[PDB]
């Protein structure tokens, strides 16, 4: 009977951990999401700049 | 004693399923680790590429003055 | 630092220049400065917690950005406007969001278009409570995800679609979704585990079923008695199918009580189980 | 009754072992991904610093142009106990890994914005030098 | 390549040029150079482990950066300074951070404003030990997170707010927070698992209520026997509510003794359970 | 505003200028303009869910992009084309990816090359069903991952290689792969838990050896009966090795039946186990 | 298309221009051109599985890159070179990394410096077998991580440090590390769990202490019966302390004989347990 209640809380001990782990995946949701979109809009404003730079090249080179 | 084998039962069933709930988390979590593992596939993609566009930007600008 | 003042200057500069103002060149150079103005305004409006004001301010900055020829960072502004209205008192949100997608869609940015699309229906269901327009979105969005190779996300959306489709009565249209999301879930041994619930749902949904549509979805199922996970899916189902085919609103309502022991019934299940619970009673009473 | 109380519980202990062991495998995959995903980020960090360094060079040049049943059953218990207490091992490891990458992403998001605003300034400071 | 050397040249560089020095031009070009200098110094200062010197060095480069007009990267430097002083021996750990947020806030950067807003409230508690000023920050910060729809972090912060609000006698103002974060958690079929603890805390927090605020919150909670996660929330609670309505400080202290076996009590719970045990004792022999 | 019009314009300008229309400088911008056109076309094609047309359109913009002198963003376009065809109905998904990797490879971008390499082998197996080429890719890709020290990934690929190698009768080359991926698994105390299965696979795979290649692999395996995990690896294996060394196709078929209890067999295992089961019978009669 | 050809063109141009060659401007672009050349060469070398050559080629491109003005992209190249030599057959893998960090360190980049610093010590142990220098690196790197208030990683490194430091002889220097990583583990209730093992290790490490350094470290410990996890920490320790204080090299060897059942004895523990087992015999006959 001892080994029984012994294993009980031990399992629950891991359950309490998953809790924190779940709170960790939520953080990885906020970051990736917003960031992935920002860095994605980066190539947009970066590409355009590379374009205008091409003009500065054909007039100053 | 019946009071033991019985208490054991209700306790074991309250031990396995206690893992069930935990098992459910490993399920959702794993499904999320792979889910969010997609964004990273784009992050790595964008990042390096963003450096390619910027690298071409810093080059032309420098040669636009020389 | 005066929002009202910024909102005024922005106006005095947001207008196609001409005469002594236009000079030799101009255009986008001014309208952009104006956008920055309204943005700063909405910023302090949210600083003072006037949100509604901040939202409408972002609406102005966004609309102006379109008049410049920059759909990208514009749509992002529409988003900001949505986050504002949402965490505000007006209801606008929805509008802004729609105006956002039309951009991300026409631009080709389907990835993000779907990223927001799901939030769209998520609001049209948690706010406006208009599932009829929510499902349409969860669906059109899942199409985009499924197109971006992104299977996982596509499935998240499908789950939303089918899940709420059964609540609306669309049972068959739900089982089809469960079947598909079930055959397209085994290709990933990292999902097999959950593939159960899918069969459980597809077999629970009954479009006034009279035969073995469910008995067939439960038979197609590959249960492994030594694979104990399945104990939360078919084993129960079979007992329910029998309690249905034998007009016994007791064996079924007893099985729901027992299964409710080894496996807690969630909202969804409950609602549907009760629906099947009455399909039996009315049949005992015909 | 002691006959169906122990046996059923035995079939219950079996469910535990497999559930955790079958979930631990998913845990491995998780850690396996956490390791890889970590490298993908240590490769993103190089970009943030690279972009912030190059943009600084662009601006300068740009502005420049501007200006026995209970026995084996108990045996399984010892197994379940050893597995669960082990489930924490990874549970904790996967924790540090996350907290680590999560912190690294913070530096990325920050610099990312600084670089974004900058690239926009360059674009605006580029359409004003033409002619 | 010497720290003091750089600091010196930096000084000779940072000064509005005038007279013979100014010549024909100048301004930002100089002050910027100085910024890079001090940063290069702060680098080797953190090397030799001077910290204090490194931190103050970053403060120099940062403040100078503002004198050039570049709030962005400046504030970031303010962060390097804050992190320096924090993991250093002098103070300023709090000032730098406030000086960083004052920038991120007005510049229209709330995403980050909250990121360091929580770090701030974390130091103002673990260091300065100013719970009343920490809560103000944890809160306003959660407000911003809620605006970014980052429900998660919003909850993280709210949990902090309520958690310390209960230690600060603010029991009722804590349960309200648990009710909100509790209702704004059911929406996600991933927080249902965590939504328990919220109800447990809210049902434990008592603003000396005489009615059944707890006997009501325990009821609002949906439980069934087949729960095993629930066994760590209301099952105990009900037994505590009866142990309070009967002034029995033996059934409450024995139940906390048993419950302290299947699920250990953190410092928080202990402090509150103790406070409730005292509301019972101080009411019995008296 | 429809693709049908754009596809035409993109052609009316993608021609090398000449005479007065040209002058001196060619039109490296014209070709790029055309690329943008087709991109816009494929864009709305993807909007109309035409896919096929979207993919072939991206192929056009990509090829032209090569006619300019930009291999990078070109290959990226090849990827967009591949994603389109993949999600589309035709083929070409395999060709676009070929033309993509040839570029990422000659360019030196192996990191991303392997990323699409595995996608390739995955399609060449799940679609075209070309295991002989799929393995070649899963493998070469793992080699690249091994170069990037991305052990984590390298193993993901090797597992695929060996897994599908045992089905193609390549038993010996399978055990070798499991040995390598097994040795490079112990170093990480985060994979020791999985290493077992590796030893089990390698021990099961038999290249018709009569010696003790498996009896040796099982011994090399470090186990401790007071272990919990290891019970699902060698323990069974031993019993199987004895049932093999005794030409007894009944204790082996019995043992697989028992083990099929504590752990229900999967696709691979079953397929191979039947093979060994036949080796014993084919060893009896003849 | 030929490596040996490019390697040739890369040399005849990587020469500081002067006199007539210089023409009008310098050659900051020449050196960069040569760099791209060697990169392309090392690129195909890695294709021919000639790794060694790829590495030395990257070393060339890297060194030249510094002769320009780009420490960043250079250091990254140093990393590519190390990756090659590492997966290659020659050495140099260690030099490239030292040079890499050299740059990341002088640049002000400690985060990434430590990222490669741990990689270094990890090579200097499981490969070069240089634990005495490896610890130096694991340590200095952990210091950098601690400088970035990144407790998470800081501990990962410290564990390595103390872990091997105990294997060597540094027991007190080990316990101290465990005390630090132990005290800086309680602040975060997300590590509460692991905190045991730290105390177990610290209590096992004996710098020839004939006292109750461990009986006192185990007394400082917060166990409490109701908590189960601790059972795999101090419980055993107490019995071992008794078996040490009574010079009984049988009770200790029997205690470890039983404990190896309820808790698997990893290599570390074993090596140390045997060391203590020797301290006892070395006290019985002294």
């Amino acid at each position: 009977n001892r080994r029984l209640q012994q294993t009980q809380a031990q399992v629950d001990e891991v359950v309490d951990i998953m809790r924190v782990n779940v709170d960790k995946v939520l953080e990885r949701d906020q970051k990736l999401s917003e960031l992935d979109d920002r860095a994605d809009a980066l190539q947009a404003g970066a590409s355009q700049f590379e374009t205008s730079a091409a003009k500065l090249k054909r007039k100053y080179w | 004693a019946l009071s033991e084998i019985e208490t054991r039962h209700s306790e074991i069933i309250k031990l396995e399923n206690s893992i069930r709930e935990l098992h459910d988390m490993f399920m959702d979590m794993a499904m999320l680790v792979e889910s969010q593992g997609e964004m990273i596939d784009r992050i790595e993609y964008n990042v390096e590429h963003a450096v390619d566009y910027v690298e071409r930007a810093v080059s032309d600008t420098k040669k636009a003055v020389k | 630092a005066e929002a009202m003042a910024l909102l005024a200057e922005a106006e005095r500069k947001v207008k196609n220049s001409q005469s002594f103002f236009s000079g030799l060149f101009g255009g986008s150079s001014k309208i952009e400065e104006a956008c920055e103005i309204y943005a700063r305004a909405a910023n302090m409006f949210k600083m003072a917690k006037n949100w509604s004001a901040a939202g409408n301010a972002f609406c102005q900055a966004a609309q102006l950005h379109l008049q410049l020829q920059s759909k990208h960072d514009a749509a992002t502004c529409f988003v900001d406007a949505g986050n504002a209205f949402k965490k505000a008192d007006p209801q606008e949100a929805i509008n802004c969001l729609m105006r956002a997608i039309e951009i991300y869609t026409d631009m080709g940015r389907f990835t993000i278009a779907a990223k927001h699309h799901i939030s769209i229906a998520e609001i049209y269901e948690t706010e406006l409570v208009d599932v009829e327009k929510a499902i349409a979105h969860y669906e059109q969005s899942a199409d985009y995800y499924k197109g971006e190779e992104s299977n996982s996300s596509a499935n998240k959306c499908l789950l939303k679609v089918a899940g709420y489709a059964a609540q609306l009565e669309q049972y068959q249209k739900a089982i089809d979704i469960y079947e598909q999301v079930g055959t397209s879930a085994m290709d990933s041994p990292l999902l097999k585990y959950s593939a159960k619930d899918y069969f459980f749902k597809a077999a629970l949904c009954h479009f006034c079923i009279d035969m073995l549509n469910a008995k067939l979805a439960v038979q197609k199922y590959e249960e492994l008695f030594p694979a104990f996970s399945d104990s939360r899916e078919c084993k129960l189902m079979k007992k329910l199918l029998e309690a249905h085919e034998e007009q016994n609103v007791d064996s079924y309502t007893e099985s729901v009580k027992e299964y409710d022991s080894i496996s807690r019934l969630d909202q969804w299940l409950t609602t549907m189980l009760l629906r099947i619970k009455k399909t039996i009673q009315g049949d005992e009473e015909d | 009754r002691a006959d169906q109380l122990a046996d059923e519980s035995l079939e219950s202990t079996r469910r535990m072992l497999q559930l955790v062991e079958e979930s631990k495998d998913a845990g491995i995959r998780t850690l396996v991904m956490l390791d890889e995903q970590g490298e993908q980020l240590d490769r993103v960090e190089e970009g943030m610093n690279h972009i912030n360094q190059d943009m600084k060079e662009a601006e300068k040049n740009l502005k420049d142009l501007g200006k026995a049943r209970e026995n084996e059953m108990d045996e399984n218990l010892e197994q379940v106990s050893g597995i669960i207490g082990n489930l924490r091992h990874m549970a904790l490891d996967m924790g540090n890994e996350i907290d680590t990458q999560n912190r690294q992403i913070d530096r990325i998001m920050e610099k990312a914005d600084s670089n974004k605003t900058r690239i926009d300034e360059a674009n605006q400071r580029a359409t004003k030098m033409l002619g």
Side-chain angles (χ1 to χ4, degrees), chain A residues 1-42 44-61, chain B, chain C, chain D residues 1-66 68-131:
Chain A
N1 185 62
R2 286 294 301 184
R3 188 67 58 180
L4 184 59
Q5 300 178 3
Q6 208 78 229
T7 306
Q8 182 58 54
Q10 292 184 299
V11 179
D12 306 301
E13 193 68 3
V14 181
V15 180
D16 300 1
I17 307 173
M18 258 292 99
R19 176 192 300 295
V20 190
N21 296 181
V22 177
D23 297 303
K24 294 188 182 63
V25 67
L26 273 293
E27 305 175 61
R28 174 156 159 279
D29 176 295
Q30 302 176 178
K31 303 179 181 62
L32 302 180
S33 179
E34 187 66 3
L35 180 58
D36 188 299
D37 299 304
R38 291 184 175 183
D40 193 305
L42 184 64
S47 181
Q48 294 297 300
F49 175 52
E50 183 181 301
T51 303
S52 298
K55 299 182 178 298
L56 304 176
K57 180 184 64 180
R58 289 185 289 292
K59 188 181 181 301
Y60 290 111
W61 188 301
Chain B
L2 292 301
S3 61
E4 296 183 357
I5 302 178
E6 182 178 60
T7 298
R8 165 182 286 294
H9 174 61
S10 179
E11 183 65 13
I12 295 182
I13 302 300
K14 186 174 297 178
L15 172 57
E16 176 197 299
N17 297 300
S18 295
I19 303 179
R20 250 66 153 57
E21 218 72 63
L22 180 60
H23 180 297
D24 287 65
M25 292 184 262
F26 277 61
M27 290 289 268
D28 301 299
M29 179 57 89
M31 181 245 266
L32 297 179
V33 180
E34 182 182 59
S35 176
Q36 286 137 172
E38 303 177 62
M39 287 63 110
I40 301 181
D41 295 359
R42 292 191 295 295
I43 298 179
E44 179 190 303
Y45 189 66
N46 294 237
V47 178
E48 294 186 298
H49 281 301
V51 182
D52 180 60
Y53 301 118
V54 176
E55 186 178 62
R56 292 180 172 293
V58 63
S59 62
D60 299 359
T61 55
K62 290 176 59 59
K63 298 180 180 181
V65 181
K66 301 178 180 180
Chain C
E2 291 284 297
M4 301 179 90
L6 297 180
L7 303 176
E9 298 184 300
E11 178 182 300
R12 299 182 179 181
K13 192 169 186 176
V14 57
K15 187 177 184 300
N16 299 5
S17 58
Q18 56 178 298
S19 183
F20 68 116
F21 200 100
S22 180
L24 188 169
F25 66 117
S28 299
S29 301
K30 304 176 181 59
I31 176 64
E32 188 171 61
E33 181 67 301
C35 300
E36 177 283 301
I37 301 299
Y38 286 132
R40 181 181 299 297
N43 179 66
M44 54 181 79
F45 278 125
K46 178 176 60 180
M47 179 72 87
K49 301 179 182 181
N50 292 60
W51 300 84
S52 179
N56 297 123
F58 284 124
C59 299
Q60 300 181 300
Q63 178 184 60
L64 301 192
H65 205 188
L66 300 179
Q67 301 178 302
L68 181 170
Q69 181 183 58
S70 298
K71 308 177 67 62
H72 283 119
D73 307 300
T76 70
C77 296
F78 291 68
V79 183
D80 296 300
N83 302 71
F85 289 120
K86 180 160 56 189
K87 177 52 189 60
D89 52 73
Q91 82 80 59
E92 292 297 298
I94 60 175
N95 181 299
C96 300
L97 295 179
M98 297 184 271
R99 290 296 306 298
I101 293 179
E102 63 177 60
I103 298 178
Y104 294 125
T105 301
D106 185 297
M107 182 60 90
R109 303 297 298 296
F110 291 118
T111 60
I112 183 60
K115 293 298 299 179
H116 283 59
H117 199 180
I118 59 177
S119 299
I120 311 305
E122 185 175 62
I123 301 177
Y124 289 44
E125 178 180 61
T126 64
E127 291 295 301
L128 299 178
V129 190
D130 191 60
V131 296
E132 60 177 58
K133 186 178 183 60
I135 305 178
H137 292 180
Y138 287 123
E139 181 182 300
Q140 181 177 59
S141 180
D143 297 300
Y144 297 123
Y145 284 119
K146 176 61 180 181
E148 296 296 303
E149 182 179 302
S150 59
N151 175 292
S152 180
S153 300
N155 293 239
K156 181 184 65 179
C157 303
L158 295 178
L159 295 175
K160 306 292 292 300
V161 184
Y164 306 125
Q167 296 293 59
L168 182 58
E169 188 283 303
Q170 300 181 60
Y171 297 120
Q172 64 174 61
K173 300 186 60 60
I175 68 178
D176 290 56
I177 302 178
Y178 289 122
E179 295 294 64
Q180 300 162 56
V181 68
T183 187
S184 61
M186 292 184 263
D187 289 345
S188 299
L190 310 181
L191 302 177
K192 176 187 62 180
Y193 294 56
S194 179
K196 308 175 302 176
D197 181 57
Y198 299 62
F199 282 112
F200 185 57
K201 291 188 173 179
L204 284 174
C205 304
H206 295 301
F207 55 113
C208 306
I209 287 187
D210 54 303
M211 67 194 88
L212 61 80
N213 181 299
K215 178 62 179 180
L216 179 59
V218 63
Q219 181 178 58
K220 294 180 60 59
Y221 182 61
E222 301 180 299
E223 175 185 54
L224 303 178
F225 296 97
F228 317 115
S229 180
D230 307 305
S231 300
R232 307 193 301 296
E233 193 287 298
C234 63
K235 192 62 185 65
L236 175 68
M237 184 54 74
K238 179 178 298 178
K239 179 60 180 59
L240 308 181
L241 301 177
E242 300 180 300
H244 184 7
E245 301 177 300
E246 306 174 306
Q247 59 175 59
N248 187 301
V249 68
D250 292 60
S251 300
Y252 179 65
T253 62
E254 197 66 60
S255 299
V256 65
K257 176 62 179 181
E258 302 180 63
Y259 179 69
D260 181 59
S261 302
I262 58 178
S263 300
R264 173 60 56 60
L265 297 174
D266 56 298
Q267 177 185 354
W268 194 77
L269 297 179
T270 305
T271 303
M272 183 171 273
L273 295 176
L274 276 52
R275 187 66 183 66
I276 305 177
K277 176 184 176 179
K278 299 204 301 179
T279 65
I280 302 177
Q281 300 177 123
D283 185 294
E284 298 177 300
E285 299 302 296
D286 187 59
Chain D
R1 182 64 181 181
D3 176 60
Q4 189 144 298
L5 293 177
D7 184 60
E8 293 188 301
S9 293
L10 181 59
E11 299 182 299
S12 180
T13 62
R14 292 187 175 183
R15 295 196 288 292
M16 293 189 256
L17 294 174
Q18 197 170 66
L19 289 177
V20 297
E21 295 298 64
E22 191 183 60
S23 295
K24 182 173 63 61
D25 297 302
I28 303 177
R29 295 134 56 180
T30 301
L31 298 176
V32 174
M33 296 182 271
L34 295 178
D35 185 300
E36 172 186 57
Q37 295 174 57
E39 300 295 359
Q40 297 178 296
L41 296 178
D42 192 301
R43 175 161 43 188
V44 174
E45 183 183 0
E46 301 178 298
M48 294 294 93
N49 306 303
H50 185 301
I51 300 177
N52 182 60
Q53 186 288 301
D54 290 55
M55 289 306 293
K56 185 178 182 181
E57 178 60 298
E59 258 293 359
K60 179 177 295 300
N61 293 120
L62 292 177
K63 63 174 59 185
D64 189 294
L65 183 58
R69 308 303 294 296
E70 293 66 62
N71 179 59
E72 182 177 300
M73 186 186 288
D74 181 61
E75 183 182 63
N76 295 120
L77 297 176
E78 179 179 358
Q79 298 182 58
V80 182
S81 302
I83 299 176
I84 277 58
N86 190 302
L87 296 178
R88 177 193 65 181
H89 185 60
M90 306 179 289
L92 296 176
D93 292 307
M94 60 177 86
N96 298 60
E97 181 62 60
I98 296 178
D99 296 301
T100 299
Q101 300 182 60
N102 287 49
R103 180 183 180 298
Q104 180 174 58
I105 302 178
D106 295 304
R107 301 193 303 293
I108 302 178
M109 300 181 269
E110 290 303 73
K111 303 175 181 179
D113 183 61
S114 180
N115 296 303
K116 182 61 179 61
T117 300
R118 273 181 158 60
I119 296 182
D120 295 303
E121 298 181 61
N123 177 298
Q124 186 177 301
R125 182 173 293 298
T127 309
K128 295 184 178 185
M129 306 186 281
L130 300 178

